[PDB]
Amino acid sequence: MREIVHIQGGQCGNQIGAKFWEVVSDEHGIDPTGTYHGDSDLQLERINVYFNEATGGRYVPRAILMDLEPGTMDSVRSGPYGQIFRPDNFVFGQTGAGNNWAKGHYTEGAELIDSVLDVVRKEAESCDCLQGFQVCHSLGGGTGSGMGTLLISKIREEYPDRMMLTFSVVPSPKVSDTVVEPYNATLSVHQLVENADECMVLDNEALYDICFRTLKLTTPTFGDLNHLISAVMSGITCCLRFPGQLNADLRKLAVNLIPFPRLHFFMVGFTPLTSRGSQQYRALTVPELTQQMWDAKNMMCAADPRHGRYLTASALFRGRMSTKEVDEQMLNVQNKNSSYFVEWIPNNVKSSVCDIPPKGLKMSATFIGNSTAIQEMFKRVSEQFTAMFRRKAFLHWYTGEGMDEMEFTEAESNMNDLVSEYQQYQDA
Amino acid sequence: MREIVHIQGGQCGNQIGAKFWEVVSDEHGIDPTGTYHGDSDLQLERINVYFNEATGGRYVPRAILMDLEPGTMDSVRSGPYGQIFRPDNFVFGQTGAGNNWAKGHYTEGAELIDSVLDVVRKEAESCDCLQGFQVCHSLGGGTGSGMGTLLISKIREEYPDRMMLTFSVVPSPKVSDTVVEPYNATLSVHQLVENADECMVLDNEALYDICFRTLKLTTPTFGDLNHLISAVMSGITCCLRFPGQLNADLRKLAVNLIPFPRLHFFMVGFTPLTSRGSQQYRALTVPELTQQMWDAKNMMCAADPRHGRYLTASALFRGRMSTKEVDEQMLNVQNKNSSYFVEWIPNNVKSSVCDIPPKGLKMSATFIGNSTAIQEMFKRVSEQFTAMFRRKAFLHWYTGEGMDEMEFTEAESNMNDLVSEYQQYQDA
Amino acid sequence: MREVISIHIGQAGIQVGNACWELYCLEHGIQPDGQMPDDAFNTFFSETGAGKHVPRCIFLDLEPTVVDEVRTGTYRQLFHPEQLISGKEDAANNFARGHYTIGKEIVDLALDRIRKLADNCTGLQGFLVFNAVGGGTGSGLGSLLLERLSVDYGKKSKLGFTVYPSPQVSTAVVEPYNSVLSTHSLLEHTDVAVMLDNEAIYDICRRSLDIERPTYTNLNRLIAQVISSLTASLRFDGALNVDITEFQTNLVPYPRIHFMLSSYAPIISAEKAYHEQLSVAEITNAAFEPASMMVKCDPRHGKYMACCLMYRGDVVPKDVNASVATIKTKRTIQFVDWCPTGFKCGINYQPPTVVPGGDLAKVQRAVCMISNSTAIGEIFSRLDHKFDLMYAKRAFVHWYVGEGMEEGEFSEAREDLAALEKDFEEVG
Amino acid sequence: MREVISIHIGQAGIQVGNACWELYCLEHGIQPDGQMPDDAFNTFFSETGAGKHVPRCIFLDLEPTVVDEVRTGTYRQLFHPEQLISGKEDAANNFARGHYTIGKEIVDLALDRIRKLADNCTGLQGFLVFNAVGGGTGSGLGSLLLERLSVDYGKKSKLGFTVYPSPQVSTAVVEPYNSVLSTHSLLEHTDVAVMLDNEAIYDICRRSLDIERPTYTNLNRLIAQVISSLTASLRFDGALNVDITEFQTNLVPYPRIHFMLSSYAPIISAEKAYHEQLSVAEITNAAFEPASMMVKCDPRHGKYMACCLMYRGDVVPKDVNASVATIKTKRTIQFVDWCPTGFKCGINYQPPTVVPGGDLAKVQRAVCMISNSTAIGEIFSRLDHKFDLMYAKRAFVHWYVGEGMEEGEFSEAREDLAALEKDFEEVGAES
Amino acid sequence: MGRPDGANGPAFLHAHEKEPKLPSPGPPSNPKQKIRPPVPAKEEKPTM
Numbered sequence A, B: 001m002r003e004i005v006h007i008q009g010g011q012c013g014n015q016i017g018a019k020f021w022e023v024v025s026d027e028h029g030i031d032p033t034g035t036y037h038g039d040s041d042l043q044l045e046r047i048n049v050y051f052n053e054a055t056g057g058r059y060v061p062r063a064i065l066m067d068l069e070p071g072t073m074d075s076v077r078s079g080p081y082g083q084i085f086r087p088d089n090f091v092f093g094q095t096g097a098g099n100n101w102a103k104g105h106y107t108e109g110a111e112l113i114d115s116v117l118d119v120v121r122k123e124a125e126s127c128d129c130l131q132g133f134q135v136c137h138s139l140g141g142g143t144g145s146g147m148g149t150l151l152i153s154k155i156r157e158e159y160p161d162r163m164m165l166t167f168s169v170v171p172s173p174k175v176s177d178t179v180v181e182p183y184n185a186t187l188s189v190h191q192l193v194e195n196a197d198e199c200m201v202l203d204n205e206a207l208y209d210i211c212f213r214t215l216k217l218t219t220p221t222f223g224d225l226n227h228l229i230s231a232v233m234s235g236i237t238c239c240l241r242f243p244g245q246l247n248a249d250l251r252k253l254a255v256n257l258i259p260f261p262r263l264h265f266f267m268v269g270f271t272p273l274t275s276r277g278s279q280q281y282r283a284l285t286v287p288e289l290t291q292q293m294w295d296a297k298n299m300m301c302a303a304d305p306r307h308g309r310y311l312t313a314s315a316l317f318r319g320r321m322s323t324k325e326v327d328e329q330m331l332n333v334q335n336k337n338s339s340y341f342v343e344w345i346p347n348n349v350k351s352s353v354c355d356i357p358p359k360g361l362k363m364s365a366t367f368i369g370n371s372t373a374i375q376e377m378f379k380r381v382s383e384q385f386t387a388m389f390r391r392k393a394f395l396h397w398y399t400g401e402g403m404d405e406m407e408f409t410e411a412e413s414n415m416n417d418l419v420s421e422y423q424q425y426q427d428a
Numbered sequence C: 001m002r003e004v005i006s007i008h009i010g011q012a013g014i015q016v017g018n019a020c021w022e023l024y025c026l027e028h029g030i031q032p033d034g035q036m037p038d039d040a041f042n043t044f045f046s047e048t049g050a051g052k053h054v055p056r057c058i059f060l061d062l063e064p065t066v067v068d069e070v071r072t073g074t075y076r077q078l079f080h081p082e083q084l085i086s087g088k089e090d091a092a093n094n095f096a097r098g099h100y101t102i103g104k105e106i107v108d109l110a111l112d113r114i115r116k117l118a119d120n121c122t123g124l125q126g127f128l129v130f131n132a133v134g135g136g137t138g139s140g141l142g143s144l145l146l147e148r149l150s151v152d153y154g155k156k157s158k159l160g161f162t163v164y165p166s167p168q169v170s171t172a173v174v175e176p177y178n179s180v181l182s183t184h185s186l187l188e189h190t191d192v193a194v195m196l197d198n199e200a201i202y203d204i205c206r207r208s209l210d211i212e213r214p215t216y217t218n219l220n221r222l223i224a225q226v227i228s229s230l231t232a233s234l235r236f237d238g239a240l241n242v243d244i245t246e247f248q249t250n251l252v253p254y255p256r257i258h259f260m261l262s263s264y265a266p267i268i269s270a271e272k273a274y275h276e277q278l279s280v281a282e283i284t285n286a287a288f289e290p291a292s293m294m295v296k297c298d299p300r301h302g303k304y305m306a307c308c309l310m311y312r313g314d315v316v317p318k319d320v321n322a323s324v325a326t327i328k329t330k331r332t333i334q335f336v337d338w339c340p341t342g343f344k345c346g347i348n349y350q351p352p353t354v355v356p357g358g359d360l361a362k363v364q365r366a367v368c369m370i371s372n373s374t375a376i377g378e379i380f381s382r383l384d385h386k387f388d389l390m391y392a393k394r395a396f397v398h399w400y401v402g403e404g405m406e407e408g409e410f411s412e413a414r415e416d417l418a419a420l421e422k423d424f425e426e427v428g
Numbered sequence D: 001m002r003e004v005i006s007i008h009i010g011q012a013g014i015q016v017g018n019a020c021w022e023l024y025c026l027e028h029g030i031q032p033d034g035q036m037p038d039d040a041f042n043t044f045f046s047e048t049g050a051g052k053h054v055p056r057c058i059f060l061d062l063e064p065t066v067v068d069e070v071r072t073g074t075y076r077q078l079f080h081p082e083q084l085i086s087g088k089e090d091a092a093n094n095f096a097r098g099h100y101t102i103g104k105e106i107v108d109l110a111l112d113r114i115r116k117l118a119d120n121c122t123g124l125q126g127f128l129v130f131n132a133v134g135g136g137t138g139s140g141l142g143s144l145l146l147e148r149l150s151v152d153y154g155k156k157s158k159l160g161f162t163v164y165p166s167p168q169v170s171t172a173v174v175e176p177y178n179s180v181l182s183t184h185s186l187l188e189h190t191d192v193a194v195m196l197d198n199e200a201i202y203d204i205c206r207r208s209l210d211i212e213r214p215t216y217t218n219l220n221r222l223i224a225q226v227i228s229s230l231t232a233s234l235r236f237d238g239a240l241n242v243d244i245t246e247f248q249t250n251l252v253p254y255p256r257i258h259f260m261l262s263s264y265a266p267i268i269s270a271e272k273a274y275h276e277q278l279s280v281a282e283i284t285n286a287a288f289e290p291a292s293m294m295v296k297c298d299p300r301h302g303k304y305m306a307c308c309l310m311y312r313g314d315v316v317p318k319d320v321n322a323s324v325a326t327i328k329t330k331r332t333i334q335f336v337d338w339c340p341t342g343f344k345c346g347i348n349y350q351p352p353t354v355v356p357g358g359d360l361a362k363v364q365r366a367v368c369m370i371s372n373s374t375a376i377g378e379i380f381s382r383l384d385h386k387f388d389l390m391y392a393k394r395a396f397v398h399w400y401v402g403e404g405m406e407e408g409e410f411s412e413a414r415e416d417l418a419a420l421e422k423d424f425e426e427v428g429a430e431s
Numbered sequence E: 001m002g003r004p005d006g007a008n009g010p011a012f013l014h015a016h017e018k019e020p021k022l023p024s025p026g027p028p029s030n031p032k033q034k035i036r037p038p039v040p041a042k043e044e045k046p047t048m
């Protein structure tokens, strides 16, 4: 009941998924052999939301690893938690995508869907009651963005009732991870506005401050950032897996969050995050979780919420606590700094709780914000796109795959409207 | 309840801020480890005015150390009591300040205000009911005098109702620890006339003689002068932290002290003060404390009471004593030398008292007086300012930071309007 | 013969089911394994052919994540496994889903239980609906269920204990909408509807209980103390045994006005009983105190149409008629002119039971008041504001219209509220 | 049955409350733990269902630092925790904060206690107010509270035992102002107003008790000996029983004139009581003595309009009427023409009780005098002088007006003293 | 929540920016309506 099927697209997706399935596995006390070795009966009761029973007491994940150039898969196929995956769920192409949204969506991606769909359905029907899909993308490259969206449009029509999530990692403002990044960005956005129920945005930049400011790290490697992203992807489905005195399914989290069908871009954070020195001073009380999650620093995206208004928000607390302190705090903020919250929504936060904190903590939280500052990711992208599409630079690669050019402008009008939707509703 | 928050801005602030927290930490029986090791329950009753309970039962200060060029902070980070501070409550910039009011107020200041304000509010909410702020300055320098007032101009606008004390160290009358002491004085004083509820004035000169004549010390290190400044700063909150047969909170001290919103420049002292030898000669009775506290030596500022008229005064006694004695004593003083006091105020003193003396003593006192001889310092400095500003010496340094000349004359006139306020009410 | 059917709908429906059914099992010595070591339990249970005392209730919900806790909790040998009804997918805080899509496919199952739950019933007092307005399951299923109960029995009485959305505390954003839609369906179908807000019961836990970490499990331990007091006459001897029909006749003047308030007294910590006598005189002054209401309504802005008082314990009628008489004279309490009477009083000799681990105190006198007042228009006009504030933009509508609903159901359910508030003014 | 409700406002209000309530728990054998090893106490307490006797008083203040002492000291199991009302921040010696800013949000919490406290007494004799005029809490809240007590209860008797600003000894600078503003609010709302100054009781500690180390813990121990001598007829059998209604009836000639002085006698150490006899005639002479007044005023500058007398101990009426007859012949003591009478005398067989570690002497005779004299117009004029001395410069005004006030409040409360001044010479008409 | 970055910039301080202003000496709103009647005028002489 209430199963979930999970997709990992691209190099980034095939690497965030490495830590995600490592984090969730430990939380349910299963070995890299796949055998359950936990203690409580609380791990087993909702284990089938991510895994499947197998002969011998194994628990194999319900993930789908898709990628061109399986080189990066050979890493995770060799890592410590690489022995758990089904080998038939590895779908890959022998050629490369070349950081090119076109061939990752038109030529090569189109050659794998016939096989990918036999994979997704084979484990979508084993679900006695499917809850939804969830993907992990990278809006910079070609494989993650291109094949990701093409996979979505096939998913959106085959399963329109169920809900698809998206932990899309978006480009960084101050540095360019690739050169053709703005082309792959918009052409993917133009697919997400229409074919996604919810979509969180992350940035490798903000993922550095939290390790440079909050965590006070020294050598933050991607192996650590993915331990951050995996902390929110685990923080969403707690109510699905663990009981709590105020549960929150995955669906009731959208209807309380998205007023209009196109503003489905969010902004996430996590709490508590302290150094290995400060854990001696700072205490763990709901007033602490509530201020650090609300701050303009734990926002894992590089968009300052203090430039717009909060339409709605959320909070998924974890750990046996007092349901009153939570309710009075989240209330105390809205009427405290009343200039950042819209007025035609009286109470614009939802609050969840769980009897089960993380594996090694006592209290924890997770934040989801739908702010009208998310438009700032789109302006900064809408300009870098129009500076180079203006002179038709790097386009012979995209048109070389038979692409048109109105698919570029349609990707810009669709965006340059989405930047206005976030302004009528922001009366400042 | 009645929580304070302490700011230490500058080289002086960061250094006397060390001795201050060294005294209070002893007064409440806590070790530099941060653990409590006192005897009475009375220590833990009002500890929350200065500290924050932590995990495992620790008490860490609620100070804020802000200073450019963290060099002097690397010292207090390495002193004996350097383990108590939260490392997060350290604000420093990689650039020098140059003993220059401009860059400490315009260029370098503006780059750290985002952090300092994000720091002060992390704890201005940790208070169930905030009483007021409390700072330490060095008016000659650039960090303490530029960032100091800049932070104040911010503090006054988000928390106007609350109170902010200021133990500002003023320039010396005869020696000048800096060649640009005037410009840093007036430009700061002008900020203190508009954005300060109370402002003591302490001078390094008077601190020497008191350490030479009265204390008979041979080599007075700055560690000794701050064992004095710490003594009086602790002497103000004894009604807050400890019981008293006539308590006196911080607010009822200003209301009872400043007749007009501008005359908030006070004058302090501490008693008793004896050499190691004379301890065996003079008794410790209330008539003793009041004889030395009213003297013209214990005035930590270099302003002579016998030149002006006391508008008001104060006294905070500490010890199981007889509250008749204090009342008849302070009455006799006004009675005998009845020309040093104005006449349109019948009784112009307050007299607190506390059941709890310092940790090593049995009876102590503490003095605060708002005289009209304080106009002399602003006369001595308003002459040195207009001396070199008339020829524009060292001005190319200030104007290089986007300053102007109106920001000078405004500062001077606003000071000259203050020196007249202290002359009308001096009817000789 | 004196029996009722106790329905629980939603999460808070079964959240209070765990408090109520932990009371009756304890109030009658019923072990969690059914059996105990007549008509004292026949109100709530049904002795089988041998020993076992199964309850007569029904836990209904859509998320198994809570109904399964009952299946694994200590009360798993108690319930008939078919009573604990549950679903696969949830309403997702969306009135439409709980009414049009998912509601229609399990009511046919729930109804069969009631038919098999009423045949053994020989004389049925009335149904008992524990509902939580504000969620899809609470508002949608509850609405769809009540209409089915009206057309089956009609002559049987439905009592609605519906948690209502509070002014400040709000665990959702769209809870205004589905709270409005509930009225058009509950009003014509419930015989009488009690109200109570999660916020008002929070402050009760602050002043009286002095419990600083309140939780949903705390409040439910108060509601169970109401129904225990409400149905004491049904199962415990006592002067002036008050049935349901009697209770209902002299409280509801018009077929519309059946929205009433509640109270309880004394509510005290187990130690302040050592500082009080809690006489019949003292308690009934506290039942009419505005701070002792279980809803954030102010009865001093309105008038009373009736009251009902259910006393418990060592109470004799000579003191009831005395304390009631000194209240009609009090000026603050205003009774609408067309009822010079207004009190139906009930006495029991069975004092209120206390649960181990509870917060209340063992007392010998207790009062539960249930008043029908015209001040109830307050809490009912706030909803008329938030609904008209968000519906001006059609926010969150595309969720309701996408689940087999329309735009008329919004304006229709809106007029019904205006049609109701006039009725709370025609009685002036 | 014969039940009164005691209030304590501000610091001095509760610092005398710790003295009176240390006396009653001792005067009825009430252990600090509520219980003891009818109607002898029912004036001040109320049995619960479990042994204890809880006092029917209210400690109200805006400073936690003085209320928590009660919560930690030996007298913490006594009070119902709800009666000890406190506040987050204080009034900061400002009449505005006690009247417009802070006082407005806690009164409802106080009144809900008074209402819960009124029903528990079957017959309410009257309220007792222990005020401290000169601060923010004592004057600002006492002002605001006394009004609300008049609306909810009306003509019920509210006494006032309010320490007044002393001429010389003064621990404040702004206490002129918040004293003046208080007058109108007490005048129109309190029924009777006894007055006493911190200085006047200092000299009495000097000469009589001979304690050269006097503090507030000494003065508060004196006021306890007054009220116990005043409310003995409420809870102790004795000839010529006198209640509160009988008290104000034949003591307050006009609705305005309700200020009066106090005098206790004898006041003697534990050793001079052996160099002494303390006859009823000697005591009552030391009672009318000006030096034994509890206010720094002079009775030989004005005229006695009425006097009350609460005797205590081995006293018989034949001796009261005899000594009083002498004073009526004494020329030093004047009396306004229109009272050939002028004494309402009370007797109580129960002598005063001594507190262990106290400074008075165990005596079987005592006298507590309260006289409504017109000489009290003196202590009422010094305030008129100092107030105008400062108010001619608008000094300290920006505080008052900066907290929800204007300037008119000064002139009203100023004239209310001016009008009240002439009344203290009008009644001395002598025509 | 604080202010967005770059908006806490220092501003110019004029002379007497923060200076309270006495409104005026003016008759107050409510004299509070004394309840007790005045003292008679020592010349009523009701006795006959």
Ligand SMILES: Nc1nc2c(ncn2[C@@H]2O[C@H](COP(=O)(O)OP(=O)(O)OP(=O)(O)O)[C@@H](O)[C@H]2O)c(=O)[nH]1
Binding pocket: A245, A246, A252, C009, C010, C011, C012, C013, C015, C016, C062, C063, C090, C091, C092, C093, C094, C132, C133, C134, C135, C136, C137, C138, C139, C163, C170, C171, C172, C198, C216, C217, C219, C220
């Ligand atoms: N007094 C009390 N109120 C509760 C409790 N649990 C939830 N509530 C309130 O019930 C409201 C939501 O009702 P739910 O039952 O959780 O939601 P639902 O009716 O099941 O509909 P779905 O969430 O879509 O399944 C919230 O406002 C809660 O504050 C509880 O245990 N005690």
Ligand SMILES: Nc1nc2c(ncn2[C@@H]2O[C@H](COP(=O)(O)OP(=O)(O)OP(=O)(O)O)[C@@H](O)[C@H]2O)c(=O)[nH]1
Binding pocket: B245, B246, B252, D009, D010, D011, D012, D013, D015, D016, D062, D063, D090, D091, D092, D093, D094, D132, D133, D134, D135, D136, D137, D138, D139, D163, D171, D198, D216, D217, D219, D220
């Ligand atoms: N007889 C007596 N007088 C006291 C005592 N304590 C204070 N006073 C006097 O009360 C007057 C000041 O009023 P306080 O009660 O101390 O302060 P407040 O009225 O509560 O106003 P805030 O300080 O704002 O709380 C002074 O004249 C004190 O001398 C005491 O214990 N006994």
Ligand SMILES: Nc1nc2c(ncn2[C@@H]2O[C@H](COP(=O)(O)OP(=O)(O)O)[C@@H](O)[C@H]2O)c(=O)[nH]1
Binding pocket: A009, A010, A011, A012, A013, A015, A016, A097, A099, A138, A140, A141, A142, A143, A144, A145, A169, A171, A177, A178, A204, A222, A223, A225, A226, A229
């Ligand atoms: N958090 C995280 N982000 C990564 C990591 N590796 C790459 N990314 C981002 O992924 C982007 C490039 O997309 P990529 O996945 O390499 O191309 P694709 O194979 O076509 O999807 C770049 O913006 C990288 O910064 C990683 O290891 N951890």
Ligand SMILES: Nc1nc2c(ncn2[C@@H]2O[C@H](COP(=O)(O)OP(=O)(O)O)[C@@H](O)[C@H]2O)c(=O)[nH]1
Binding pocket: B010, B011, B012, B013, B015, B016, B097, B098, B099, B100, B138, B139, B140, B141, B142, B143, B144, B145, B169, B177, B178, B204, B222, B223, B225, B226, B229
């Ligand atoms: N009481 C005391 N005063 C000091 C001490 N050190 C410096 N001061 C004063 O600090 C003044 C200079 O300001 P400073 O804070 O050192 O430089 P800034 O960082 O630019 O403000 C000088 O007048 C010093 O006398 C000290 O150790 N103890």
Ligand SMILES: [Mg+2]
Binding pocket: C010, C011, C093, C135, C136, C137, C138
């Ligand atoms: Mg629900």
Ligand SMILES: [Mg+2]
Binding pocket: D010, D011, D135, D136, D137, D138
């Ligand atoms: Mg006070």
